[PDB]
């Protein structure tokens, strides 16, 4: 409703860097709000794409941002009669970024890894890796839970069980309010997908540079499966956390697997031990149900509600014809120990190939009416196909079925405006929560400030 589409703010990165692929708000130890931006194709030292991170201070006029520096050099360690190797070319540093307390986590899902032992090898595979920074102090740490030192022949002799070689850890990421980093790894266990959790404090205190293989004892990984419903399901394509079991001491995990069960797609809600509490199945094969997930209480009962995006959903139209437009599903959490029912609301896109539901961002209470609101991206939507973000207001019964406001992309064709979203943070301290929108195709980020309601 009351986001201002007249006076925007633009931050820009280097051409070709894909500045805006991921973003998040970041607060320093003094509460000052900045913007962390991932640019997964920023050039590195060898004039080669490795990715990069930028930490943008809040200025109404926007502009350029300083780099958040991470070690971009390939590493080698000869130890235990083996050779350990990291490969950072085209790793995609900045394909996901998240901020918690005064700490920034920025991941490279396609960092490769290999181990050599005489004439055998582990195989050079994308285990992924995440980088952690405390900007005010300069502290640095890393976390790569899928690096192993097992040789290729052992996996073959053991029928490829517990094969973490293609995790792509950091493909998605989230932090609990207690400080536990949770990583999505959609390629884990031979492309079933896995989750990796560890406390940020323990990640820092157990890391030292040059070790490459080290133990984070408090960590916790999910499990392999023999159930074919999970094969190639990409469990961990997206992640989120919320309160869904009525017990406030436990934190629950929300995991997207958009190709679960022969591309039907699914979303699962789990406890912190990866035990399955609920499962929400997709409506239509190949619609990518589970591409995005979001958790926020939209109907003011104080119980977290769930939203699922299926950007490739095909809507039925006249004369038995389908049109790909995208769809968003709303599930309201019921009172007490009960399972999530059918969706309370279905939101369906309008523009062909618009990919409505590619990103869903909670906004907090944008219009200050006592109900939290959401924003949905259609990165190729709008009548021009340039991209659109749509705002939906909460209400006692859920969400309004029609958008209160529509943000048309200010960028040229192909910017992917809305591919990443973030709200619920007041960046200018005017008392209204604001919204940042990434458009990596144009290497830019747009800031929409919320202003007082007109109506």
């Amino acid at each position, epitope marked *: 409703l009351n986001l201002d589409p007249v006076q925007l703010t633009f931050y820009a990165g280097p051409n070709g860097s894909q500045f805006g692929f991921s973003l998040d708000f970041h607060k320093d130890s003094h509460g000052r709000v900045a913007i962390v931006v991932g640019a997964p194709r920023t050039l590195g030292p060898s004039q080669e794409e490795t990715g990069g991170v930028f930490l943008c201070p809040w200025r109404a006029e926007g502009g350029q941002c300083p780099s958040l520096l991470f070690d971009l050099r390939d590493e080698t360690r*000869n*130890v*235990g009669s083996q050779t350990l190797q990291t490969f950072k070319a085209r790793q995609g540093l900045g394909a996901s970024v998240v901020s918690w307390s005064d700490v920034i986590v920025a991941c490279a899902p396609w960092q490769h890894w290999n181990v050599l032992e005489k004439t055998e090898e582990a195989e050079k595979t994308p285990v992924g890796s995440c980088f952690l920074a405390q900007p005010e102090s300069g502290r640095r740490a890393e976390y790569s839970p899928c690096r192993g*030192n097992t040789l290729s022949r052992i996996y073959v002799e*053991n029928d490829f069980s517990w094969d973490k070689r293609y995790c792509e850890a950091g493909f998605s990421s989230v932090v609990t309010q207690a400080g536990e980093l949770v990583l999505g790894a959609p390629g884990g266990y031979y492309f079933l997908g896995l989750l990796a959790q560890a406390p940020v404090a323990d990640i820092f205190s157990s*890391y*030292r540079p040059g070790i490459l*293989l*080290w133990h984070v004892s408090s960590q916790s990984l999910s499990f392999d499966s023999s159930n074919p419903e999970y094969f190639d399901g990409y469990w961990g394509y997206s992640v989120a956390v919320g309160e869904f079991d009525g017990d406030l001491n436990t934190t629950e995990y929300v995991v997207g697997a958009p190709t679960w069960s022969w591309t039907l797609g699914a979303v699962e809600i789990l406890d912190s031990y990866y035990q399955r509490l609920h499962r929400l199945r997709g409506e239509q094969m190949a619609s990518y149900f589970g591409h995005s997930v979001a958790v926020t209480d939209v109907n003011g009962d104080g119980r977290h509600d769930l939203l699922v995006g299926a950007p490739l959903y095909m809507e039925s139209r006249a004369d038995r014809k389908l049109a790909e437009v995208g769809r968003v599903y709303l599930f309201l959490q019921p009172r007490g120990p009960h399972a999530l029912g059918a969706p309370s609301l279905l939101l369906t896109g309008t523009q062909l190939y618009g990919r409505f539901g590619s990103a869903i961002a909670p906004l907090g209470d944008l219009d200050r009416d006592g109900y939290n609101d959401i924003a949905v991206a259609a990165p190729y939507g709008g009548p021009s196909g340039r991209g659109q973000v749509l705002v939906f207001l909460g209400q006692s019964e859920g969400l309004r079925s029609r958008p209160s406001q529509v943000l048309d992309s200010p960028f040229p064709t192909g910017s992917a405006f809305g591919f990443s979203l973030r709200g619920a943070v007041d960046i200018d301290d005017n008392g209204y929560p604001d919204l940042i929108v990434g458009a990596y195709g144009a290497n830019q980020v747009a800031v929409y400030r919320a202003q007082p309601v007109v109506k």
Partner: antibody
Amino acid sequence: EVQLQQSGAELVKPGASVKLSCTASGFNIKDTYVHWVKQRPEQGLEWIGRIDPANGYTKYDPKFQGKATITADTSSNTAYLQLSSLTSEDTAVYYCVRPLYDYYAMDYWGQGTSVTVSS
Amino acid sequence: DILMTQSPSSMSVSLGDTVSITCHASQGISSNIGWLQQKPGKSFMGLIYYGTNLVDGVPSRFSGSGSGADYSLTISSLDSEDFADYYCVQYAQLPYTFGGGTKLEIKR
């Protein structure tokens, strides 16, 4: 807190066999490698070998091949060192070791188990 | 197998002194070395791993340095508990191999 409690002092005869144990406390024995080290006053410290209790794969110094066998039971959180065809040279104190953070280090040690071979 | 020549086998020193123990390898080990302490009649405690990194709980008066095949352990301002046996161990290659040890004894 990580603690490695080993079995009591052993006292056996030449030619017999003995099986020492190393029970993990405060953690899961499955977490890291578990090594076995032999100490004598004259010969010093000798690395026997290691085991990955997760999968059971073992490595050995070729000096101990056939004499020492390293096993582990994740169910009982314990690792074992079995010595056969015992002789007077096998009389020593034996330690189990695991690393702290580095996968290959030797940081945490058990209190040791004394073995004496005598007719 | 990699030989670890540790020196000296013993030193007679005093409280508050700054002493150093070296360890020489028959080939390069690229900081894959740990340092160990054994108090009299007791078991082992880890001090250093990967050349320079203190084990959790170890005071900072202990430090390790070196590169290639030559490494050192320094104890600034000796303490009454610091009189014990010290050993190096390399893990650059299997089998792991140890040094001969070093006993710090009280001078009088």
